[PDB]
Amino acid sequence: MNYKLTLHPGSNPVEEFTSIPHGVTSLDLSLNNLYSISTVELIQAFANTPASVTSLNLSGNSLGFKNSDELVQILAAIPANVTSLNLSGNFLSYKSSDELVKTLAAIPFTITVLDLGWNDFSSKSSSEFKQAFSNLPASITSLNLRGNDLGIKSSDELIQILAAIPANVNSLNLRGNNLASKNCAELAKFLASIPASVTSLDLSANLLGLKSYAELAYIFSSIPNHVVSLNLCLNCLHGPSLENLKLLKDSLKHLQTVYLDYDIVKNMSKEQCKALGAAFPNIQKIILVDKNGKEIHPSHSIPISNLIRELSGKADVPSL
């Protein structure tokens, strides 16, 4: 269960943490002006965290402007039970390369899922990215780089940044990076360089719907063989005409899992569904997602269950 712990300027962290009920699995400390909290108290508060907590949200705390040595201490002091850490929206890019290296190296090896979204990382060169990320604990298999305006980077720099992704990362979130700002050829080359290690890729909310379908077809086909799970939601796909969809034929044939906007498939005809499904002929799991980014369970909606069958190209007795 989730639990938001609101901290005020005068709050004592140690006292506030005692009120966290046992059973809490996800602890939200976001938007708490943590950059100005007493480091000693927060370190102590961390020691009295319920063992059930496996997820920690430190987002929106201006931590980029917290004394660097103290930031290192706070990260090192994160309870061992915590496996997922959200450091998004913290102005981390204001930290120099040398401070940033120590900061990231301070993240406990116990962390396997890391959110570095919304940290102005577009301000870093690929050399600085490489230096920064080379010090991440090798325990990290899931890395979130959402909202870092990566789409503003020249294609050459973007390709080197992909080179900087730790070899242990198998799940990469590139959501909301204005990636469709780049022209088709550039974007196709970028995607072709997705590291061999990455088998899950999130490209949601990247304005991909602004591209022509012939462009998208080329873009999708450039996604390497090894990425078998792809999130394409919130990409504003327009006029999914039957001929448009036809162009995407086979372009995502390596996919095993795909995430799609329910609002998009919801209005498609059988033929349209079959045509979209033809982009990923080897699909294994389709996941439709509502407006708020919530996965929609097949086995409690008839329409949803019909959509999937029709997008999977599965057949029932009548149809045959």
Transcribe 68-93 into DSSP letters. Answer: HHHHHHHHHTS-TT--EEE--SS-GG
DSSP labels for 80-131?
TT--EEE--SS-GGGS-HHHHHHHHHTS-TT--EEE--SS-GGGS-HHHHHH
Are 191 and 215 in contact by the 8 Å Cβ rule? The answer is: no
Are 181 and 157 in contact by the 8 Å Cβ rule? The answer is: no
- DSSP 8-state code for residue 21: P
Beta-strand runs (E) in the chain = 2-4, 26-28, 55-57, 84-86, 113-115, 142-144, 171-173, 200-202, 229-231, 257-261, 285-289
In angstroms, the CA 257 to CA 313 distance is 14
Is the four-CA dihedral 189, 192, 197, 201 of positive or negative sign?
positive
Sorted by sequence, the CB contacts under 8 Å of residue 314 that are 6+ apart come out as none
Are 257 and 287 in contact by the 8 Å Cβ rule? The answer is: yes
In angstroms, the CA 110 to CA 306 distance is 42
Are 132 and 97 in contact by the 8 Å Cβ rule? The answer is: yes
Local structure of 179: helix, strand or coil: helix
Half-sphere CA count of 267, side-chain side, radius 13 A:
9
What are the structure tokens assigned to 305, written together? 């269950």
Q: How was this structure determined?
A: X-ray
CA-based end-to-end distance of the chain: 46
User: Which of 217, 164, 167, 165 is closest to 187 using CA atoms?
Assistant: 217
- DSSP 8-state code for residue 150: G
Residue for token digits 């982009």?
Answer: 279
What are the structure tokens assigned to 103, written together? 């900061």
In angstroms, the CA 79 to CA 46 distance is 6
Half-sphere CA count of 181, side-chain side, radius 13 A:
13
Are 276 and 265 in contact by the 8 Å Cβ rule? The answer is: yes
CATH class of the domain at 2-310: alpha beta
Resolution for this PDB entry, in angstroms: 2.1
Local structure of 276: helix, strand or coil: helix
In angstroms, the CA 212 to CA 230 distance is 20
Dihedral of CA atoms 178, 29, 169, 217 in degrees, nearest 10, equals -30
In angstroms, the CA 63 to CA 29 distance is 12
Q: How many residues does the chain have?
A: 320
Residue ranges per structural domain of the chain: 2-310
